[PDB]
Nucleic acid binder design. Sequence first.
DNA 1: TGCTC
DNA 2: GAGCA
DNA 3: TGCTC
DNA 4: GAGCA
DNA 5: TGCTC
DNA 6: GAGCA
DNA 7: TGCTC
DNA 8: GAGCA
Lengths: 194, 194, 194, 194
Amino acid sequence: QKTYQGNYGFHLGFLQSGTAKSVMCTYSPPLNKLFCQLAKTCPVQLWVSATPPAGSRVRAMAIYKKSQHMTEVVRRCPHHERCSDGDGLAPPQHLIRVEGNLYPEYLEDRQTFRHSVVVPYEPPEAGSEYTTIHYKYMCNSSCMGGMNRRPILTIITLEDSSGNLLGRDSFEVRVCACPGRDRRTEEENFRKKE
Amino acid sequence: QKTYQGNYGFHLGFLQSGTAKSVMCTYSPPLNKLFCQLAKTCPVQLWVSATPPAGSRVRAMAIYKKSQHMTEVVRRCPHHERCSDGDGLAPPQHLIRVEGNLYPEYLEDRQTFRHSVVVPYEPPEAGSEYTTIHYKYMCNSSCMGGMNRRPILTIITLEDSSGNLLGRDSFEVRVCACPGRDRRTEEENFRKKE
Amino acid sequence: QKTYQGNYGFHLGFLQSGTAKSVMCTYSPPLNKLFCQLAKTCPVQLWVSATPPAGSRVRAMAIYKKSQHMTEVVRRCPHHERCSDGDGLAPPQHLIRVEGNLYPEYLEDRQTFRHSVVVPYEPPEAGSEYTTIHYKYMCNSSCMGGMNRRPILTIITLEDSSGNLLGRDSFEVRVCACPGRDRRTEEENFRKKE
Amino acid sequence: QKTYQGNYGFHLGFLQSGTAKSVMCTYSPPLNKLFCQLAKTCPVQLWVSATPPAGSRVRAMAIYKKSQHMTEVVRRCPHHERCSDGDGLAPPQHLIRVEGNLYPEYLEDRQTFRHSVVVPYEPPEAGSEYTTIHYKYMCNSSCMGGMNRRPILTIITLEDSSGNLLGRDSFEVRVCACPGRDRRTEEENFRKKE
DNA sequence: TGCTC
DNA sequence: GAGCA
DNA sequence: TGCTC
DNA sequence: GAGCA
DNA sequence: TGCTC
DNA sequence: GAGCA
DNA sequence: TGCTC
DNA sequence: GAGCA
Ligand SMILES: [Zn+2]
Ligand SMILES: [Zn+2]
Ligand SMILES: [Zn+2]
Ligand SMILES: [Zn+2]
C-alpha cells in the first residue's frame, strides 16, 4: 500500500538532472513526481541493499492519486487505444510499457481489472549500486476519455517468485508536452509555501 | 460546390448579436464563421425570395476547410462516439445533429461515406422573412482523433424532392469552450490587416 | 514536348502569394518553379479560353529537368516507397498523387515505364476563370536513391478522350523542408543577374 | 553490457592522430567516439595483457546509444541495402563489415535479430602490444530509413570458443561526410563545459 | 538542406 | 522561423 | 484552448 | 468571465 | 550535414 | 577544405 | 496545456 | 523554447 523498503532496502532512484533526456523525462525530488512526454523512455532505478531471492520480479502499476478516482482503472484513452502504435507485446489498452525487455508480462487483475507489467528482477551491473528499468507512458495525463487531467501514481513493487510482496515504492507522474515547463510551474507553486 | 443562390435566392442568415445565446453561439460576419459550444443549439436562418417547389429539403454536411484534409470524412472523435449522449435519432458518429425535428434523416453517402442530415424544407412563419433550423455540433474542433484542431465548413443545401441542387451556402465553424473569447481573437487578428 | 496552348488556350496558373498555404506551397513566377513540402496539397490552376471537347482529360507526369537524367524514370526513393503512406489509390512508387478525386488513374507507360496520373478534365465553377487540381509530391527532391537532389519538371497535359494532345504546360518543382527559405535563395541568386 | 576488461585486460585502442587516414577515420578520446566516412576502413586495436585461450573470437555489433531506440536493430537503410556494393561475404543488410579477413562470420541473433560479425582472435605481431582489426560502416548515421541521425555504439567483445564472454569494450560512432569537421564541432561543444 | 526547439 | 546539423 | 472557481 | 492549465 | 568545385 | 545546400 | 515555427 | 492556442 504505502512505501515499504522491506528486508531488502528496496526503493526507487531517478535520473540525475542536466542530461538532455531531461527534455523528455525530468524528475522533481521535492514533489517526488516524474514529468515526461508520451512514449518516451523513462529510466527508473531500483535500489536494494541485499540481493532479492531467486526468481524475484518487478511490477509496475498505475493508479489514480485522488481517492475520488482511486477505484477507476487507469487505461489509455479511446483514441490512443486504436492508434496502432503497438510494439507487438504491450496490449493496446495498457498505459505503461516496459522498454528493452523481450519477455515482459502484461497482466489484468481478475478482481480489480487493473493493468500491470511484470519483468524479472535483475541485479545491478558490476560496479553499479542500482538496476535501471525503462518505462514508457502511452497517453498524456490530459487525454480526454482517459486520465483526463487526473494525476496518477506509478506503483513499483518487488515481489518474490510466488507473488509475495518484498518491497514497494511509488512516485507521481504527469505525462505532458513540455515536462520542463510544467515541472517548473508545479515547483515554484510548491516553493511558494517554503 | 461554391455558394449558389439559384432561382430561389437561397442563402443563410445568422442570429443577431447581444442576445445571451451569444455565450454558446456567436457568429462573425467578417469571418463568416460560427463560434459555438459542443451540443448547444445553433439557430441557422434560411432565406429564399421564392417558395421552393413541393417536397424540397434542406441538407447539412461538414467538410474540412483545408484542401490538405478536404478528402477526410468529418466524424466525431473516438471518445464522444462512445459517450452515449444519443438523442435516439442521430447515429453516434455524426458530428452534426438537427434539434427540434422528430423526423430527420441521417445519411452516409455510398461513395464518399460523408455524413449529412436532411430535414424537410419549411417556409417562414406568417410575417417572417426566414425559416430557422437548429443544429448542434457534437465534438469540439480540437477533439483528438476527431477534427483535431482542423477548421471545418458546414455546407447547407436546398434540394428538391428528387435530390437536385436548388441552392447552396456555407459558413466556417469552430466548436470550442469559449466562443466569445475565441471569436474576439480571430477577429482582431483579421482586423490587423484592415 | 514544349509548352503548347493549342486551340483551347490551355496553360497553368498558380496560387496567389500571402495566403498561409505559402508555408507548404509557394510558386516563383520568375523561376516558374514551385517550392513545396512532401505530401502537402498543391493547388494547380488550369486555364482554357474554350471548353475542351467531351471526355477530355488532364495528365500529370514528372521528368528530370537535365538532359543528363532526362531518360531516368522519376519514382519515389526506396524508403518512402515502403513507408506505407498509401491513400489506397496511388501505387507506392508514384511520386505524384492527385488529391480530392475518388477516381484517378495511375499509369505506367508500356515503353518508357514513366508514371503519370490522369483525372477527367473539369470546367471552372460558375463565375470562375479556372479549374483547380490538387497535387502532392511524395518524396523530397533530395531523397537518396530517389530524385537525389536532381531538379524535376512536372508536365501537365490536356488530352481528349482518345489520348490526343490538346495542350501542354509545365513548371519546375522542388520538394523540400523549407519552401519559403529555399525559394528566396534561388530567387535572389537569379536576381543577381537582373 | 558495460565495459569489462575481464581476466585478460581486454580493451580497445585507436589510431594516433596526424596520419592522413584521419580524413576518413578520426577518433575523439574525450568523446570516446569514432568519426568516419562510409565504406572506409577503420583500424581498431585490441589490447590484452594475457593471451586469450585457444579458439577465442572477436565480435563486433552495433546498437543504438539512446534507450529510446535501444531495442531497434541497427541495419542499413533501404537504399544502401540494394546498392550492390557487396564484397561477396557481408550480407547486404549488415551495417558493419570486417576488411582483410577471408573467413568472417556474419550472424543474426535468433531472438534479438541483431547483426554481428565474428572473426577469430589473433595475437599481436612480434614486437607489437596490440592486434588491429579493420571495420567498415556501410551507411551514414544520417541515412533516411536507417540510423536516421540516431547515434550508435559499436560493441566489441572477446569471447572464447564456446561463446562465453571474456571481455567487452565499446565506443560511439558517427558515419559522416566530413569526420574532421564534425569531430571538431562535437569537441568544442563538449569543451564548452570544461 | 533536413531537423530540433 | 532560427539555429544547428 | 479546455477547465476550475 | 478570469486565471490557470 | 551531404555535395560541388 | 570551403561554400553552398 | 498541447501545437506551430 | 517561445508564442499562440
Ligand atoms: Zn491518450
Ligand atoms: Zn470529440
Ligand atoms: Zn523519398
Ligand atoms: Zn544508408
